[PDB]
Design a protein around this ligand. Structure first.
Ligand SMILES: *[C@@H]1O[C@H](CO)[C@@H](O)[C@H](O)[C@H]1NC(C)=O
Ligand SMILES: *[C@@H]1O[C@H](CO)[C@@H](O)[C@H](O)[C@H]1NC(C)=O
Ligand SMILES: [Ca+2]
Ligand SMILES: [Ca+2]
Ligand SMILES: [Ca+2]
Length: 305
């Protein structure tokens, strides 16, 4: 299934770690390792979703000036990915909030996105993710923030790049149709929107346990979203998923991917949660060559790599 999915890869986390803002590099946070990214590219990945924290990039206000050193470090990783011939999805890993408050100014968010898209507008292998996992916020506001981002990105002259939109309820696939129906209203002049949903396989869907509910839970939790995408003539992507390195989860992951792979009219691929250099013994670490999921799950992913 080499050419079944358009994009298949991994999240690259570390720059959003910690609670200290701005914090300090090497203590509170770290950027992804280009070597470890190279190794995943060598295994066949062609997509990396790169996390960063808005308040580190923009320490004063969201329409204010950059921390140019944090930005340069982000750009180094983006260039490693795209020089590698992979797509780099830029992920402000911010939960629809900035300095702990919901982003209620769609004007300010559109400007944030005009400015950031301006940094990458010439790089056709960059993609833009509006914000990670909106939750516990007004649904009209979520729609209008996603539209503000699209408006800002295109206003900047970033016209080649795909734009990954995220919904409420932590953009979960299993709750999509229940809460995010309004998101079908989003418009892009370039018609390059991708609906990004996230899915975990544990009992409460929080991704905090290594146990999966059952062998079919992954397929189960993306079925209603698949039909929504079909009915509304949209395309989607699973931007974060994981399972523990055990047999029931290996089945549930394989079954979710197999079902998506029979529905590529709507599914454009997936990105595992997560790689990056500071995960240690994390149950879902894809960081090569010793992460738990790298050694325990990569053989299920290899069909698509
Ligand atoms: C940028 O990364 C270099 C290491 O390559 C490091 O010395 C520096 O502290 C980082 N600065 C940040 C993230 O603001
Ligand atoms: C795969 O997709 C085709 C329609 O494209 C359908 O005929 C077939 O039943 C699907 N397979 C499964 C296992 O649902
Ligand atoms: Ca069927
Ligand atoms: Ca291959
Ligand atoms: Ca393969």
């Amino acid at each position: 299934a080499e050419f079944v999915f358009e994009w298949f890869g991994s999240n690259e986390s570390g720059a959003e770690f910690g609670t200290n803002i701005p914090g300090v590099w090497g203590t509170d946070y770290i950027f992804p390792d280009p070597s470890a990214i190279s190794t995943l590219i060598d295994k066949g990945m062609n997509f990396f979703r790169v996390q960063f924290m808005m308040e580190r990039l923009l320490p004063d206000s969201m329409t204010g000036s950059y921390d140019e050193e944090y930005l340069a470090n982000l750009t180094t990783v983006i260039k490693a990915v795209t020089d590698g011939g992979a797509h780099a999805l830029v992920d402000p890993h911010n939960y629809g909030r900035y300095n702990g408050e919901i982003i209620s100014s769609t004007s300010d968010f559109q400007t944030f996105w005009e400015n950031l898209a301006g940094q990458y507008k010439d790089n056709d292998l960059v993609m833009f993710d509006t914000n990670n996992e909106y939750h516990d916020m007004d649904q009209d506001l979520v729609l209008n923030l996603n539209q503000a981002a699209i408006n800002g990105i295109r206003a900047a002259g970033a016209t080649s790049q795909y734009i990954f939109v995220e919904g409420n309820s932590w953009t979960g696939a299993w709750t999509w149709v229940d809460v995010n129906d309004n998101m079908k209203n989003l418009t892009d002049p370039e018609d390059k929107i991708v609906y990004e949903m996230h899915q975990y396989l544990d009992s409460d869907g929080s991704g905090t346990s290594e146990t999966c509910v059952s062998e079919t839970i992954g397929k189960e939790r993306v079925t209603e979203a698949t039909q929504w995408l079909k009915d509304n003539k949209k395309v989607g992507f699973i931007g974060a998923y994981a399972g523990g390195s055990n047999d029931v989860c290996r089945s549930a992951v394989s079954g979710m991917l197999e079902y998506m792979a029979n529905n590529t009219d709507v599914w454009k691929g997936a990105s595992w949660w997560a790689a990056g250099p500071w995960w240690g013994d994390y149950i879902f670490s894809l960081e090569p060559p010793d992460g738990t999921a790298y050694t325990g799950m990569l053989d299920i992913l290899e069909a698509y790599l």
